[PDB]
Design a protein around this ligand. Structure first.
Ligand SMILES: Nc1ncnc2c1ncn2[C@@H]1O[C@H](COP(=O)(O)OP(=O)(O)O)[C@@H](O)[C@H]1O
Ligand SMILES: Nc1ncnc2c1ncn2[C@@H]1O[C@H](COP(=O)(O)OP(=O)(O)O)[C@@H](O)[C@H]1O
Length: 374
């Protein structure tokens, strides 16, 4: 029973509909899951029953191979006896009123990651439930608004190269469907955190940063001449930047998440923190958590050094393949989370340094600054 159909873009329709996820005319469905991909409750239990034991069995193997998932994650499995070849498992957050904006961030991310997986498998149609609104306690209104916003951003941020043509928003309950239909109706340069830490969008080369600390993205072997970000810093710094990094790196088993500190030489800052950022890897649990850990660590270092400001470029969004909107939203959320749960003595400003030519990054950050400021 269809409640509304809304044309998003040429060839793309959003359909709000009462129905059962186990039985819909789509290529793939998104299951509302948990960290262990264990389908003991809610919609997941109904899906699992209709699928038979293959679904849980393949999920157990995925968790065994890649480890447990975290909130705001998604993965894909086999579908057993469902009328689909795969099921996408979204892990929404467990709701807390004390952490509402972070929960919003994590639900949105699980949806964005699920869409990405669908587009990677070239699917044309997907059904999506009110993830987190059952056992995980997310207030129904905010939940559906968040899911619908994620979908709008999916087609609005990058308009090119989408395979998806039908998106179904579904639940067995008439009340949840009406919430979805209402959400659809409604949806279609400086920030400051509660603790006082301020975020600035700065449109220039990171080699022109005038913060205490500047963040660089480097590969495993610490060579600074290979990515356009490090190369820009190396050219403005002088070759002693390379020699000092190699020196401070001696004896380090460098890996994803390694952060090494050097002086600035010809740069206008006091220190450079060189980070080894993860590959996107289809938005894996590790890729997202490690990037967040890196961002938190650079801030903690700046605080521990009694300094006031740090400049981040859009690390991970070139060679390493992080979608730029997803990254911007990740670093912004992380800065709010850290700022909110910590009493900072000296750290007061975070600058996002975006290259003048990088219009996609500028739009990513501007869009999120706008959502946050409203
Ligand atoms: N057995 C079921 N059959 C159909 N829908 C269900 C069933 N159990 C829960 N739901 C609905 O699925 C949606 C998601 O809830 P749930 O499965 O608990 O996911 P979550 O843990 O992420 O909140 C909610 O609308 C919930 O009412
Ligand atoms: N001089 C610069 N200042 C700020 N940002 C830059 C500069 N040069 C490139 N960028 C942006 O830095 C981001 C990261 O690029 P890259 O050097 O490939 O690092 P990564 O391996 O972490 O993806 C890209 O979005 C690129 O557009």
């Amino acid at each position: 029973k269809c409640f509304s159909r809304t044309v998003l873009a040429p060839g793309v329709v959003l359909i709000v509909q009462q129905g059962d996820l186990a039985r819909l005319p789509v290529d793939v469905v998104v299951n509302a899951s948990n960290e262990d991909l264990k389908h003991y409750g809610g919609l997941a239990a109904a899906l699992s029953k209709a699928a038979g034991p293959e679904l849980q069995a393949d999920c157990d193997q995925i968790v065994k191979r890649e480890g447990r998932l975290l909130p705001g994650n998604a993965t894909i499995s086999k579908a057993g006896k469902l009328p689909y070849h795969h099921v996408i498992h979204a892990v929404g957050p467990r709701w807390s009123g004390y952490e509402a904006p972070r929960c919003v961030y994590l639900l949105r991310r699980a949806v964005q990651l699920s869409l990405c997986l669908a587009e990677k498998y070239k699917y044309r149609s997907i059904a999506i439930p009110a993830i987190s609104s059952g056992v995980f306690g997310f207030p129904l209104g905010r939940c559906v608004e968040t899911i619908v916003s994620a979908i709008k951003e999916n087609f609005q941020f990058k308009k090119d190269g989408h395979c998806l043509k039908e998106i179904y928003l579904v639940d067995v309950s008439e009340k949840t469907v009406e919430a979805f239909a209402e959400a659809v109706k409604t949806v279609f340069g400086s920030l400051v955190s509660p603790g006082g830490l301020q975020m600035l969008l700065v449109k220039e080369g990171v080699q022109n940063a005038k913060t205490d600390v500047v963040v660089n993205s480097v590969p495993l072997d610490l060579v600074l001449s290979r990515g356009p970000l490090s190369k820009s810093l190396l050219e403005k710094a002088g070759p002693e930047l390379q020699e000092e990094l190699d020196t401070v790196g001696q004896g380090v088993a460098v890996s994803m998440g390694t952060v090494l500190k050097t002086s600035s030489w010809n740069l206008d800052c006091r220190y450079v923190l060189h980070v080894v950022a993860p590959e996107w890897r289809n938005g894996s649990t590790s890729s997202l958590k490690i990037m967040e850990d890196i961002i938190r660590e650079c801030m903690e270092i700046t605080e521990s050094l009694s300094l006031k400001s740090i400049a981040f470029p859009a690390i991970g969004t070139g060679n390493l393949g992080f979608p730029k909107n997803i990254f911007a939203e990740l670093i912004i959320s992380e800065v709010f989370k850290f700022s909110s749960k910590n009493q900072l003595k000296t750290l007061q400003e975070v600058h996002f340094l975006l290259h003048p030519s990088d219009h996609e990054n500028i739009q990513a950050f501007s869009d999120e600054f706008a959502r946050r400021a409203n």
